[PDB]
């Protein structure tokens, strides 16, 4: 029943370079995109779905962007991490940078605003440090020296005391920020760098890696659960988004994949740029999906690829 509830992704809207990050605001009303074009763009979701297209805010940045995270309490605030290492908090109504955190010494691949302590945000960098910041303070409040490049950091959705850290050392380091001498647990299983970590719930953590797998982990009992396979991801950040039941990720075949958390093989997938009639130009391997984001626990998702095309997709029977 679960495997067969949905068999396809329907395209319900399309905006037609690399988009590194696509994220919904606190209420799933606006979404923002950012990437190599050094421009944070904010769109109204309903307008995109209903109309035959223009962002409502554009904020120019000095450096290429790697990640966005909206504040979970302050509707109008969004954080970005950039390739200079700067972690910026922006106000999308005034367009101003509210904070410019400059301690990282190399590109910051990831930033995440906490859901439960919403002034707290965490970043990770090629400088091998995890930094925790508070929007009321200019200096970092916690620093973890990880000794390998950090590709992704994510707060637990139920408590700001726990973060998952995906590392180029192939492991997920799960920290209690109240005692950083050692992580609570380090999860091994991926055979390549861990590019994303995202929580389905307080106790369920998912990861993506350039070993062409996603993995599901139990962070209450510190157990491996399941490995998901089907997509191609051997090189790039191709996006990971999860909700209470589903995982979605990109692929280096210009395809989005969806998995139900209980089944190791995809429930469906969607090709960007499938040829029609006599089309005979670039092959599928020439583009990658670069960012994905569920609309909370619904079957609706945002997706973007390395050409800059954005699609709103919906799981359907």
């Amino acid at each position: 029943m679960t495997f067969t509830r949905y068999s396809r992704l329907r395209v319900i809207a399309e905006i037609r370079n690399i988009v590194s990050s696509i994220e919904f605001d606190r209420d799933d009303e606006l979404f923002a995109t950012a990437g190599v074009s050094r421009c944070i763009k904010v769109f109204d979701f309903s307008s995109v779905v209903n109309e035959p297209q223009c962002p409502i805010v554009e904020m120019s940045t000095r450096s290429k962007l790697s990640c966005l995270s909206w504040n979970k309490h302050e509707k109008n605030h969004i954080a970005s991490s950039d390739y200079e290492g700067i972690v910026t908090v922006w106000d999308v109504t005034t367009r101003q940078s509210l904070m410019e955190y400059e301690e990282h010494e190399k590109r910051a691949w990831s930033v995440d605003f906490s859901r439960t302590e919403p002034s707290m945000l965490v970043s990770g960098s090629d400088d091998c440090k995890v930094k925790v910041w508070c929007t009321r303070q200019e200096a970092s409040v916690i620093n973890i020296d990880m000794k390998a490049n950090i590709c992704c950091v994510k707060y637990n959705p139920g408590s700001s005391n726990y973060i998952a850290v995906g590392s180029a050392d192939h492991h997920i380091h799960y920290y209690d920020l109240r005692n950083i001498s050692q992580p609570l647990h380090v999860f091994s299983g991926h055979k390549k760098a861990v590019s994303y970590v995202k929580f389905l719930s307080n106790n369920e953590l998912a990861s993506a890696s350039t070993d062409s797998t996603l993995r599901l982990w139990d962070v209450k009992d510190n157990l491996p659960v399941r490995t998901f396979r089907g997509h191609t991801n051997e090189k790039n950040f191709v996006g990971l988004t999860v909700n209470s039941e589903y995982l979605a990720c990109g692929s280096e075949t210009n395809e989005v994949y969806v998995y139900h958390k209980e089944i190791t093989r995809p429930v469906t997938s969607h090709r960007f740029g499938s040829p029609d009639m006599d089309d005979a130009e670039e092959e599928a391997g020439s583009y990658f999906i670069s960012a994905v984001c569920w609309k909370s626990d619904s079957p609706t998702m945002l997706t973007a690829n390395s050409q800059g095309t954005i699609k709103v997709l919906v799981l359907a029977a």
């Binding site: 690399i18 590194s20 190599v36 290429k64 390739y83 090629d126 390998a148 490049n149 590709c151 590392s167 180029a168 050392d169 192939h170 390549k192 760098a193 590019s195 350039t210 090189k235 790039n236 950040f237 990658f288 670069s290 390395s306």
Partner: peptide, 8 residues
């Protein structure tokens, strides 16, 4: 390459 994931 700008989105290449690092290896240790």
């Amino acid at each position: 390459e700008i989105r290449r994931v690092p290896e240790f």
